[PDB]
Structures are given as structure tokens and as C-alpha cells.
Amino acid sequence: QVQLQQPGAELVRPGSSVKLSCKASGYTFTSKWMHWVKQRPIQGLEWIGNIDPSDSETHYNQKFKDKATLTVDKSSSTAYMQLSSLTSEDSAVYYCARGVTRGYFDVWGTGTTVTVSSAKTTAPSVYPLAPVCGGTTGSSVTLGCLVKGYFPEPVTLTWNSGSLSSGVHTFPALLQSGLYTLSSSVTVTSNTWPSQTITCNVAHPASSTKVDKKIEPR
Amino acid sequence: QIVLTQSPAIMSASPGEKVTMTCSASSSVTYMYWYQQKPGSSPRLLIYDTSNLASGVPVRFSGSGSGTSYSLTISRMEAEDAATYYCQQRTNYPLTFGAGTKLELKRADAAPTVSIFPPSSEQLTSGGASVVCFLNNFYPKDINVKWKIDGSERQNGVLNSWTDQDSKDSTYSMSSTLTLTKDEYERHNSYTCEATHKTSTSPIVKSFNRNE
């Protein structure tokens, strides 16, 4: 029923501004309070402010003035949030939230990930990782696919076009001077490799890239 | 303006046993609110005004407390409960959250599996050389990595990324990657990644040679 849809990700340079929105349905928008919450990696949830469209009431966190300017649109149906300053401090996940009066929240939005960086959008690389020269110890062989130097997130990594998914560990990317680095491991038996073909597939929507790299034995 | 401290920070509980999580406030508080957030999903309201339960909340969650000390109790721990839990307060505007009690599912001690990979020829073409060491399937999360080049330890240029607890076997996995230049890589021969886990004092050692 109650759904609070908001766009995926926004990527804006330091200094400039962002206008976040929240498409609300499943309930009467003009009846219940709309709150905004900021979540950072390892610092916890931080409440920003809240608007009541009735009765126009706009509350703010004293630490968030005047970085955030909250406005609403009734048509159309949306709740807006403009971030004015934008610094490396602002890089976080911003959540839409419905609530009945102050000050707790019932339903949360999908969340928009905001990345404040001076870096430019760049294409990925993709590298094949092969085991040691000779043989692998045991019966289970381990293969990898290293993706180094790409901006921004995300990247969809699939093995064998989607035919291989069991025993796959995809590791979250880390920021390394403007460009991300991601790795993924796969564990299969020695009877499948290198007897059958194994290929890691990486696609980046922001750069329109499609790389299929075959792991050849050393 | 009240500071809320949730204790403990990381919870470890086995399925089918009582779970008591606590939040502590700086000063007197009238009503408390709790929030559940599963990995890769939006948070949701669990308990409101301390005691009462939100719609859609399974019958196993309970809340109580007063003034400064408040508690969320799970009568019987289930697999779909492994999530981060957050404190929430009013009557002091803000309107602040707690640190976040991470409820992590319990598993019988697991030993890490190590696979070391030499830098690819495609990267060595560019001038860079990244040695990747995969640490797969281990319990618990806490582990130590030690990169040794020809015996000597290296600390700068090391990248370490952990995964969230698996839904099937409930084990952690991390990726250790040391980045070096083509000049720095070819000056030395032996490259070792050591895994120091709680399961065994003896480090799990996987290494290779450059000239071979």
C-alpha cells in the first residue's frame, strides 16, 4: 500500500546543489508528517528535519541549517529537499520517511545515495585472476575477477552470463582516490575447470561498457 | 540533545533463545522507539511508545523500560531477525538515534580458506601490480591480515573489504589487496599473505614466487 519512491543515486561536484524528491502514494499525502533522515557508513542515523503539509510546519535540526531547505509540492505529490553547501561530509544515504505527528516514523523511502566528489565518470577495466602455475590444492579450484579503477557505483558482476551463481562471493567496493576497486571470488570443483568455459561479465551503465573476460590457465 | 547509547554494539545469538538489547539515555525520556534495518534494505518501525508494536511486526518482539534505561527483548531468535537495531527519542528535539545494536547470527567456529593470486599480465602492462589474497568462509568476523614481502612486512597500499554475514552458512569473507608499482613488484621475489584468526594461533599461510 504505502510506498515512498525516490530516485536511485545523485552525483554532484563540491559547491553545487542537489534537489532530492520523494514520490508518495498509498495514503493521503497532506495528512501525515514527512521526515528526512541522513545515514552515514559508520556514524549512525541522523535526523535532518520534517514538514507537515496542512498547516505548513517546517522543523529543522539546528546542525542542518542552512544546508537543507525543505519544500513540498502537492500536485504532484512530492516532498523536496535541497542541499545547498555540499562537501565531502555530505556523502551519505538520504531517507524519505512518513510519520503520524512528531516525532516518529512509520514507513521509510527507498533511499537515495548521494556522492559528493570532484571525480569524473570513468569506465571500468576488468582483469582475469588465475591460480598458481601448475595445480590447485584439493578438489575445489578458486577463480577471481578483479575490477579496478571505475567511477561511479555500481557494477553488475555475473559469472557465465548467469549460469554460475552457487559459491560466489562478491566483495563490496572501496574508494581509492576517485576510482573504485571491486573483486569477486568463485569456488568450483576441478572437474569443471579448465574442462568447461568460465567467464566473468561486468557491465557499467554510466559508461555503457560490457566486458566478458575468459580466465585462461597460466 | 540527549545522547543515546545502545549496548552492546555487536550482538551474537543462536536461533531459538531469548535476546535482550538495551538502550540508555542521558536524561529522563517519556517514550521510546525502535527501528529494524536488514542489510541492503530500508529501515522500518518495530516498537512505538516503548511498548506497542507496529503493524506487520511478528509476535516475538517486545519492549519495556522507563526514564533512562529501556530494552528491546526478542523472546525467540529467528533467522530473519539478523539485522541492525536503532534507538530513537523525542521530548528533547532533537530527535536523535542510538549507535546501533548489530544483531549477528551465531555459527559454530569456522576456519578461513586462503587463495593467493599473482598480479595479472594485463595490469602489469599498465605499470601497476596488485596482489590479491582472498579469505573465504570464517567465523567470527574479526581477523588479522599480514602481507610479507621476502619476509619483511608491508603496511601501506593495503586494501581490506569485508562482506555481510551469509544467509545460508552464516560465515564472513574478506578481500585483501596490496597495490604496488611494476618497479616495486619486480625488485622482490617472494609474496605472502598471512591470516591470523581466533580459531587457531598458527597463521594460515599461502604464498608464491615471482620468478616461477
Author numbering:
A (entry chain H): 1 to 218
B (entry chain L): 1 to 212
Text taken from the publication that reported this structure:
Chikungunya virus (CHIKV) is a mosquito-transmitted viral pathogen that causes fever, myalgia, rash, and severe arthritis in humans.
These Fab structures were fitted into the cryoEM maps of the corresponding VLP-Fab complexes. The footprint of CHK-9 and m242 Fabs onto the VLP localized primarily onto the domain A and did not include any part of domain B. Indeed, binding of these fragments to the VLPs had nudged domain B ∼10 Å sideways, out of the way of the Fab fragment.
